[PDB]
Design a protein around this ligand. Structure first.
Ligand SMILES: [K+]
Ligand SMILES: [Mg+2]
Ligand SMILES: [Mg+2]
Ligand SMILES: [Mg+2]
Ligand SMILES: [Mg+2]
Ligand SMILES: [Mg+2]
Lengths: 126, 206, 292, 126
RNA sequence: CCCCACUAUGCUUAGCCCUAAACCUCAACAGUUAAAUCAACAAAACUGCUCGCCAGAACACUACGAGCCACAGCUUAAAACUCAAA
């Protein structure tokens, strides 16, 4: 009335802060391009950006945690961790589709390594 | 700082370590044992276990230095010492038999005594309380007056009135003047002691 | 909370995994040890994460799991310990033992155990004042003429201060083709890097890059810096030095050579003299360098 | 009145300060308070009453020795209540607030400055 | 309020006046220390017996009447109106 009367779960990657990237956390993407003397770092980063967007859009609400984008030679391993909510047939169809799409996208032998988990693996709570 | 807080300053005193264990007190024994555990900083370029080392002259040389040119500062210091030595030898050769016993020829003794003769024990501290600045007498610490003597000597030797007289020659003359309680630096000490006696009624503001 | 069944199962999985890892590495599972577990896990799963606890580990479940559950009374209800009803049976039993030893004696580098690890040993929470009382009793026991059982009993409650900084590495003494003994060492100051060889016997000749030291170092300050090590331990004119310095400037090179000569001279002096040099700052690398 | 039970359980301001200063000096002139206080020869610089008359601060000149200063402080703090009682008993003031003995810090500066000006060289007849 | 001066008065004699936080804020006598000692505080809790006094607050140490060496005095001492408190 009168004026005077008036007067969250987190996974391992989410839980740990960025200053543990080389102490506790790791690197999701692993490529030689960024090393000293190696070239094409920006190209690899652009590929990583698109690849993460396309995985998260091709597996909506399925990925339990972030991908791991490994590259050896011309190979491109997406080691992803997903849930057990979708039917296995849909997972197989999406794996085939995304593998072929990315292999013709980058002209390189892309591959997927889906790892299903029952639910989000919470590390702690913030 | 690139040293961690654990690092301690080194002790360069050479005869301290040769002290017999029998002479060591329990406290001194304890601290000697304690230093074993501590980390010690690297000794800086400068002080050394040399028997000719003089911290006062080193500080004077550092205070004369300009732009980090330490070689030139030490050159000026040694030239001043040599000039004082030669002037005293010249005065000694021309003195009477009885007058040669009271003529000091050691440049280090002259330097130390000349600086000691210029040390002020009282100074002033500008303090504005009532809207007007008030200079109040305050007793000077030993380090403060040791610094002030050196600063006054160097500033007096840096005056532009001394045209083309090289720094070693001016500094030797000023040192020999202050050795005999003469010259403008002794007068600057006296004018501070007088101007602090003229305001002994302002000590109540402290 | 981890039930005892859970820990039992984890022990089982650790044992089967131990035999599996032994099979994978080709070593004999019978003699396969925990150090072998650590090394094999490091090899199979490389990780340069600085935190050693963030790296892969396969430890025995006993060390990992903080599960504790101690029963203080049996099915009949009678407590096992005669000091149970005090609530601090372990602490008061220890105090009783200490007091009994003190009575017996009356008839006749390291640190004290800190409060938290005393609680860990007793497996009982205790306050500050009772810890102080226990430490006072231990000190009193030390003051008396402690016999054998007494001082190993006290040693149970004294940890080791492993921070002895007198750990300068004495360079091994080498021998040249002429049979002369010498020692080599390195040093660094700013961008200057020096390597010095000090001979056990000599006439005080220092050769810097094959040049006499008074010719290589015109400035007296550098020569005093080269003096400082030998003069500090009263052996001027008793050794020969052959040093090579590169990079940096006059003062940085002089400091690097001083450090190198001190570290090489540590070989021919006593341990007490090594410690005196360390306390004088003659054996420490100067970490001060230009800042961005 | 069962004392057993009780024991167990501004121009005006300047005039009052002057009166209290005179009274306290007269009290310290004799062993009326105690012989230990009398032997100390305590001297007062001033008396200041707080603006709300909640405390009386008596500033006593300090000496150079520190042990004597500590002893003087102890005796004065132990004697303050007795001096308050004497002041009201003599009817110097009807009500005296609690007396707090404060060390006069200013006088030491002048003392040190005097001990230095004694030995100073000022120059030739100037 | 502080300083100076000075009265009634404080003193004696002979009469009055009859009031005080005139209070140990405990009525006088006799008795007990056993019971749950005992609202609280004050000052440990009670018993027998007797006199005096009290029955919501305020109006009210008041009005009127009466008595008094008192005459702006003292003792005794109400009612009306009002309130849900005191
Ligand atoms: K009363
Ligand atoms: Mg009375
Ligand atoms: Mg009666
Ligand atoms: Mg009656
Ligand atoms: Mg009534
Ligand atoms: Mg009446």
């Amino acid at each position: 009335r009168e004026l005077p009367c008036a007067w969250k779960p987190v996974t391992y990657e989410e839980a740990h802060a960025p200053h543990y990237i080389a102490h506790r956390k790791g690197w999701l993407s692993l490529h030689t391009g960024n090393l000293d003397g190696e070239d094409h770092a920006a190209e690899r980063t652009v590929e990583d950006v698109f690849l993460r967007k396309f995985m998260w859009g091709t597996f909506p609400g399925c990925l339990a945690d972030q991908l791991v984008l490994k590259r050896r030679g011309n190979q491109l391993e997406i080691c992803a961790v997903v849930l057990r909510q979708l039917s296995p047939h849909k997972y197989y169809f999406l794996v085939g589709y995304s593998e072929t799409l990315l292999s013709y996208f980058y002209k390189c032998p892309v591959r997927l390594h889906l790892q299903t988990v029952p639910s989000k693996v919470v590390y702690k709570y913030l | 700082s690139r040293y961690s807080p654990e690092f301690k300053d080194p002790l360069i005193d050479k005869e301290y370590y040769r002290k017999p264990v029998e002479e060591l007190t329990e406290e001194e024994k304890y601290v000697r044992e304690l230093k074993k555990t501590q980390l010690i900083k690297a000794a800086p370029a400068g002080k050394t276990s040399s028997v000719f080392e003089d911290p006062v002259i080193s500080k004077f040389t550092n205070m004369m230095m300009i732009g980090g040119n330490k070689v030139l500062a030490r050159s000026l210091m040694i030239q001043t010492l040599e000039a004082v030595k030669r002037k005293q030898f010249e005065k000694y050769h021309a003195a009477s038999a009885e007058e040669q016993a009271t003529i000091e020829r050691n440049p280090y003794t002259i330097f130390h005594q000349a600086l000691k003769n210029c040390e002020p024990m009282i100074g002033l501290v500008p303090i504005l309380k009532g809207g007007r600045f008030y200079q109040v007498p305050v007793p000077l610490p030993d380090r403060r007056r040791r610094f002030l003597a050196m600063k006054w000597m160097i500033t007096e030797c840096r005056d532009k009135k001394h045209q083309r007289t090289l720094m070693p020659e001016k500094l030797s003359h000023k040192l020999l003047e202050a050795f005999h309680n003469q010259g403008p630096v002794i007068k600057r000490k006296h004018d501070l002691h007088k101007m602090a006696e003229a305001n002994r009624a302002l000590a109540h503001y402290r | 909370t981890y039930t005892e069944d859970f820990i039992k199962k984890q022990i089982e999985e650790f044992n089967i995994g131990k035999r599996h890892l032994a099979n994978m590495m080709g070593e004999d599972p019978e003699t396969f040890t925990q150090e072998d577990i650590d090394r094999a896990i490091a090899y199979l799963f490389p990780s340069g994460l600085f935190e050693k606890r963030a790296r892969p580990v396969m430890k025995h479940p006993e060390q990992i799991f903080p599960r504790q559950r101690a029963i203080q009374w049996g099915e009949d209800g009678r407590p096992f310990h005669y000091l149970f009803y005090t609530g601090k049976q372990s602490y008061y039993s220890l105090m009783h033992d200490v007091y009994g030893m003190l009575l017996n004696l009356e008839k006749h580098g390291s640190r004290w155990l800190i409060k938290e690890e005393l609680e860990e040993m007793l497996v009982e929470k205790l306050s500050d004042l009772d810890y102080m009382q226990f430490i006072r009793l231990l000190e009193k026991l030390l003051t008396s003429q402690c016999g054998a059982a007494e001082e190993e009993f006290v040693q149970r409650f004294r940890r080791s201060v492993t921070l002895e900084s007198k750990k300068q590495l004495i360079e091994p003494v080498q021998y040249d083709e002429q049979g002369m003994a010498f020692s080599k060492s390195e040093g660094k100051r700013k961008t200057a890097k020096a390597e010095a060889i000090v001979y056990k016997h000599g006439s005080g000749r220092i050769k810097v890059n094959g040049i006499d030291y008074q010719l290589y170092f015109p400035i007296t300050q550098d020569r005093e810096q080269l003096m400082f090590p030998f003069h500090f331990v009263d052996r001027l004119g008793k050794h020969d030095v052959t040093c090579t310095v590169s990079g940096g400037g006059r003062s940085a090179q002089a400091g690097a050579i001083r450090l190198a000569m001190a570290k090489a001279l540590c070989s021919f002096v006593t341990e007490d003299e090594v410690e005196w040099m360390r306390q004088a700052g003659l054996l420490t690398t100067d970490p001060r360098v230009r800042e961005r | 009145k069962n004392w057993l039970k009780k024991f167990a359980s501004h121009a005006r301001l300047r005039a009052l300060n002057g009166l209290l200063y005179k009274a306290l000096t007269d009290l310290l002139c004799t062993p009326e308070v105690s012989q230990e206080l009398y032997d100390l020869n305590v001297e007062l610089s001033k008396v200041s009453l707080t603006p709300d008359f909640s405390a009386c601060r008596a500033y006593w000149k300090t000496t150079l020795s520190a042990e004597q200063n500590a002893h003087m402080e102890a005796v004065l703090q132990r004697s303050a209540a007795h001096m308050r009682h004497l002041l009201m008993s003599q009817q110097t003031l009807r009500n005296v607030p609690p007396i707090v003995f404060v060390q006069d810090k200013g006088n030491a500066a002048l003392a040190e400055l005097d001990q230095l000006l004694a030995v100073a060289d000022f120059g030739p007849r100037d």
